[PDB]
Amino acid sequence: QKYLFIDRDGTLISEPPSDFQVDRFDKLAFEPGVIPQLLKLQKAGYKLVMITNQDGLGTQSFPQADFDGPHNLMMQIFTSQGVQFDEVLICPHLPADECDCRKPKVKLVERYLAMDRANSYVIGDRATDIQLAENMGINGLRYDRETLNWPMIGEQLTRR
Amino acid sequence: SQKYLFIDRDGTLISEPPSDFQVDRFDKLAFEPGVIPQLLKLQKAGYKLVMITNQDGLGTQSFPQADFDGPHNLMMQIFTSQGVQFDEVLICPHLPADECDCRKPKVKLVERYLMDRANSYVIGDRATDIQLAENMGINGLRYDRETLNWPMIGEQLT
Numbered sequence: 001q002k003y004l005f006i007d008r009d010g011t012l013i014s015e016p017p018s019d020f021q022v023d024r025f026d027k028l029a030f031e032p033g034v035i036p037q038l039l040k041l042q043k044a045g046y047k048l049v050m051i052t053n054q055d056g057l058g059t060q061s062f063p064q065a066d067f068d069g070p071h072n073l074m075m076q077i078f079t080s081q082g083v084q085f086d087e088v089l090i091c092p093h094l095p096a097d098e099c100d101c102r103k104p105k106v107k108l109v110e111r112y113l114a115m116d117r118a119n120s121y122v123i124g125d126r127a128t129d130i131q132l133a134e135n136m137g138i139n140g141l142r143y144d145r146e147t148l149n150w151p152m153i154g155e156q157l158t159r160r
Numbered sequence: 161s162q163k164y165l166f167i168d169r170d171g172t173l174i175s176e177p178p179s180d181f182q183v184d185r186f187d188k189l190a191f192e193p194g195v196i197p198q199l200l201k202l203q204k205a206g207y208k209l210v211m212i213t214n215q216d217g218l219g220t221q222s223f224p225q226a227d228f229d230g231p232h233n234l235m236m237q238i239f240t241s242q243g244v245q246f247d248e249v250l251i252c253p254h255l256p257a258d259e260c261d262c263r264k265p266k267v268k269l270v271e272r273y274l275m276d277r278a279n280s281y282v283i284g285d286r287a288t289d290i291q292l293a294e295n296m297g298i299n300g301l302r303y304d305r306e307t308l309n310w311p312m313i314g315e316q317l318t
């Protein structure tokens with residue numbers, strides 16, 4: 001079973017450059033082509049898993065209610081359009097917490113470590129996503145809106 | 161002559177709030193099933209898209225422009241980022257009691273188009289959308305999430 005482990009902020013949707021928190025609806029923006037390209041990937045047999053660090057989620061620095069509006073709308077778009085994430089895995093911790101689950105640690109995905117490692121990938125926009133791939137023993141794809149975008153990924157991962 | 165789809169917004173592209181028929185909060189925004197992939201399919205088949213919507217009392221106390229703008233502009237972001245493009249977004253802001261010239265199924269908003277009529281459609285969830293189609297002299301599709309939905313329309317028209 002081929003899996004795609006996909007980052008949220010800066011990958012599925014844009015990441016706010018001020019505080020890196022999608023905590024208002026006016027900070028929610030989808031990356032280009034993510035919907036048709038995830039549908040394409042699913043049709044080729046990939047299952048999808050979302051994996052994301054959300055520093056301080058559920059605390060006064062990033063209230064659960066502030067995260068929920070934009071996140072739930074994002075998920076309603078995916079689901080209604082036919083994009084299904086098997087799991088949405090979140091680390092809510094601060095870096096200083098030194099938790100077991102903050103990417104690039106693999107705790108959140110331990111159950112997948114089970115899958116076809118040769119044909120599974122982490123997709124994310126940061127060095128930490130690529131390091132997660134290395135820690136998982138799978139391939140890493142560094143999302144970039146210009147140099148490795150959703151259409152390119154959809155093509156690359158369905159090449160035969 | 162261009163094939164057009166004239167598509168209603170509320171209850172057709174996005175869910176219609178059952179409470180009060182106004183998408184006036186972000187938390188009332190929800191996309192209809194399959195609308196994105198199907199509109200992309202329809203665009204690839206050569207249809208151009210025009211949105212047309214009655215927004216009762218838009219820009220007054222019971223529906224401020226600012227309340228409409230947030231959810232609408234976000235809906236537009238989502239469609240545009242995913243490759244769905246509307247040539248025009250046509251809005252009637254008036255109350256029914258106003259008895260204006262632009263309220264569907266009156267044809268004012270779309271006068272310019274009055275187009276390959278044999279292959280153009282109004283798609284909407286209300287009888288008035290179907291009447292608009294008749295007044296424009298083109299085909300009408302009565303969108304229903306359960307019985308005549310986006311995958312069905314995408315299949316039929318391609």
Ligand SMILES: N[C@H](CO)Cc1c[nH]c[nH+]1
Nearest residue numbers: 009019020021053054055
């Ligand atoms: N957006 C970052 C990565 O997903 C996590 C974060 C939340 N608050 C501040 N930083």
Ligand SMILES: [Cl-]
Nearest residue numbers: 016017018019
């Ligand atoms: Cl910002």
Ligand SMILES: [Cl-]
Nearest residue numbers: 007052053103
């Ligand atoms: Cl992250």
Ligand SMILES: [Cl-]
Nearest residue numbers: 022067070071
């Ligand atoms: Cl969020």
Ligand SMILES: [Cl-]
Nearest residue numbers: 168213214264
């Ligand atoms: Cl209407």
Ligand SMILES: [Mg+2]
Nearest residue numbers: 007009010125
């Ligand atoms: Mg990221």
Ligand SMILES: [Mg+2]
Nearest residue numbers: 168170171285
């Ligand atoms: Mg309607």
Ligand SMILES: [Zn+2]
Nearest residue numbers: 091093099101
């Ligand atoms: Zn953690």
Ligand SMILES: [Zn+2]
Nearest residue numbers: 252254260262
């Ligand atoms: Zn009017």
